[PDB]
Enzyme design. Structure first.
Site, PDB file in Angstrom:
ATOM      1  N   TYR A  38      -3.227 117.959  86.665  1.00  0.00           N
ATOM      2  CA  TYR A  38      -3.088 119.228  87.377  1.00  0.00           C
ATOM      3  C   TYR A  38      -1.612 119.489  87.672  1.00  0.00           C
ATOM      4  CZ  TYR A  38      -8.130 119.089  88.079  1.00  0.00           C
ATOM      5  OH  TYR A  38      -9.481 119.027  87.829  1.00  0.00           O
ATOM      6  N   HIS A  40      -3.240 122.664  85.204  1.00  0.00           N
ATOM      7  CA  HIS A  40      -3.431 122.911  83.779  1.00  0.00           C
ATOM      8  C   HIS A  40      -4.102 124.257  83.552  1.00  0.00           C
ATOM      9  CE1 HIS A  40      -7.761 122.032  83.695  1.00  0.00           C
ATOM     10  NE2 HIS A  40      -7.520 120.945  84.407  1.00  0.00           N
ATOM     11  N   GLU A  58      -5.254 126.242  87.007  1.00  0.00           N
ATOM     12  CA  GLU A  58      -6.034 125.760  88.141  1.00  0.00           C
ATOM     13  C   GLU A  58      -5.346 124.572  88.809  1.00  0.00           C
ATOM     14  OE1 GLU A  58      -9.491 123.315  87.643  1.00  0.00           O
ATOM     15  OE2 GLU A  58      -9.503 123.702  85.494  1.00  0.00           O
ATOM     16  N   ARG A  77     -10.552 124.860  93.868  1.00  0.00           N
ATOM     17  CA  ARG A  77      -9.332 125.140  93.116  1.00  0.00           C
ATOM     18  C   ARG A  77      -8.770 126.519  93.420  1.00  0.00           C
ATOM     19  NH1 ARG A  77     -10.881 120.795  92.259  1.00  0.00           N
ATOM     20  NH2 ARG A  77     -11.572 119.802  90.318  1.00  0.00           N
ATOM     21  N   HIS A  92     -16.714 124.089  92.399  1.00  0.00           N
ATOM     22  CA  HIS A  92     -17.811 123.475  91.661  1.00  0.00           C
ATOM     23  C   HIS A  92     -19.036 123.417  92.572  1.00  0.00           C
ATOM     24  CE1 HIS A  92     -15.817 122.246  88.025  1.00  0.00           C
ATOM     25  NE2 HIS A  92     -14.869 121.604  88.689  1.00  0.00           N
ATOM     26  N   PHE A 100     -18.001 126.736  87.463  1.00  0.00           N
ATOM     27  CA  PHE A 100     -17.361 127.192  88.685  1.00  0.00           C
ATOM     28  C   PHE A 100     -18.051 128.472  89.145  1.00  0.00           C
ATOM     29  CE2 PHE A 100     -13.502 124.917  87.080  1.00  0.00           C
ATOM     30  CZ  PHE A 100     -13.075 124.300  88.244  1.00  0.00           C
TER      31      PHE A 100
HETATM   32  N1  LIG Z   1     -15.632 125.340  84.015  1.00  0.00           N
HETATM   33  C1  LIG Z   1     -14.403 125.484  83.493  1.00  0.00           C
HETATM   34  N2  LIG Z   1     -13.660 124.424  83.106  1.00  0.00           N
HETATM   35  C2  LIG Z   1     -12.473 124.761  82.556  1.00  0.00           C
HETATM   36  C3  LIG Z   1     -11.984 126.019  82.378  1.00  0.00           C
HETATM   37  N3  LIG Z   1     -10.730 125.989  81.771  1.00  0.00           N
HETATM   38  C4  LIG Z   1     -10.503 124.727  81.585  1.00  0.00           C
HETATM   39  N4  LIG Z   1     -11.519 123.904  82.016  1.00  0.00           N
HETATM   40  C5  LIG Z   1     -11.650 122.445  81.670  1.00  0.00           C
HETATM   41  O1  LIG Z   1     -12.666 122.297  80.603  1.00  0.00           O
HETATM   42  C6  LIG Z   1     -13.461 121.089  80.805  1.00  0.00           C
HETATM   43  C7  LIG Z   1     -14.949 121.347  81.096  1.00  0.00           C
HETATM   44  O2  LIG Z   1     -15.198 122.067  82.298  1.00  0.00           O
HETATM   45  C8  LIG Z   1     -12.811 120.416  81.992  1.00  0.00           C
HETATM   46  O3  LIG Z   1     -11.828 119.511  81.424  1.00  0.00           O
HETATM   47  C9  LIG Z   1     -12.189 121.596  82.777  1.00  0.00           C
HETATM   48  O4  LIG Z   1     -11.090 121.186  83.627  1.00  0.00           O
HETATM   49  P1  LIG Z   1     -11.225 120.621  85.149  1.00  0.00           P
HETATM   50  O5  LIG Z   1     -12.410 119.722  85.124  1.00  0.00           O
HETATM   51  O6  LIG Z   1      -9.888 119.971  85.334  1.00  0.00           O
HETATM   52  O7  LIG Z   1     -11.459 121.839  85.940  1.00  0.00           O
HETATM   53  C10 LIG Z   1     -12.766 127.118  82.783  1.00  0.00           C
HETATM   54  O8  LIG Z   1     -12.488 128.295  82.645  1.00  0.00           O
HETATM   55  N5  LIG Z   1     -13.960 126.770  83.334  1.00  0.00           N
END
Ligand SMILES: Nc1nc2c(ncn2[C@@H]2O[C@H](CO)[C@@H](O)[C@H]2OP(=O)(O)O)c(=O)[nH]1
Ligand SMILES: [Ca+2]
Ligand SMILES: [Ca+2]
Length: 104
Positions: A38, A40, A58, A77, A92, A100
């Site tokens: 993070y 990212h 995020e 986030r 989450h 999300f």
């Molecule tokens: N749900 C969700 N996850 C995202 C998105 N963009 C990137 N991710 C990343 O895609 C993977 C599946 O959710 C995770 O590695 C998540 O990161 P984080 O878990 O760090 O949030 C998004 O728009 N939505």
């Protein structure tokens, strides 16, 4: 009253500004913290209606009021863009698997 409610977590605008400033600075310096790296890019797979433009990033915001430094990111986030504008606050909590939902 809460400016943003993520599940049971209550956040004020100042909490978000504080969290965003930390995440944005790391972004500008090209650095990441935590095993999930993070901040990212946030791809907006959920399809939220963000008024501001992309790209989005995020960064975890913590209920304790402390700024994230590398441990467990939690469920909440703050999402910001390239111009340092807040796109939204998501969580989450209340969402299926790794999805999300927006904080009210
Ligand atoms: N749900 C969700 N996850 C995202 C998105 N963009 C990137 N991710 C990343 O895609 C993977 C599946 O959710 C995770 O590695 C998540 O990161 P984080 O878990 O760090 O949030 C998004 O728009 N939505
Ligand atoms: Ca607070
Ligand atoms: Ca503290």
């Amino acid at each position: 009253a809460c400016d943003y409610t993520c599940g049971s977590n209550c956040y004020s605008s100042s909490d978000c500004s504080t969290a965003q400033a930390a995440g944005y600075k790391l972004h500008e310096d090209g650095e990441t913290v935590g095993s999930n790296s993070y901040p990212h890019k946030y791809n907006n797979y959920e399809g939220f209606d963000f008024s501001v433009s992309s790209p989005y990033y995020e960064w975890p915001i913590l209920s304790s009021g402390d700024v994230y430094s590398g441990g467990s990111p939690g469920a909440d986030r703050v999402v910001f863009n390239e111009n340092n504008q807040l796109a939204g606050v998501i969580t989450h909590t209340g969402a299926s698997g790794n999805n999300f939902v927006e904080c009210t």
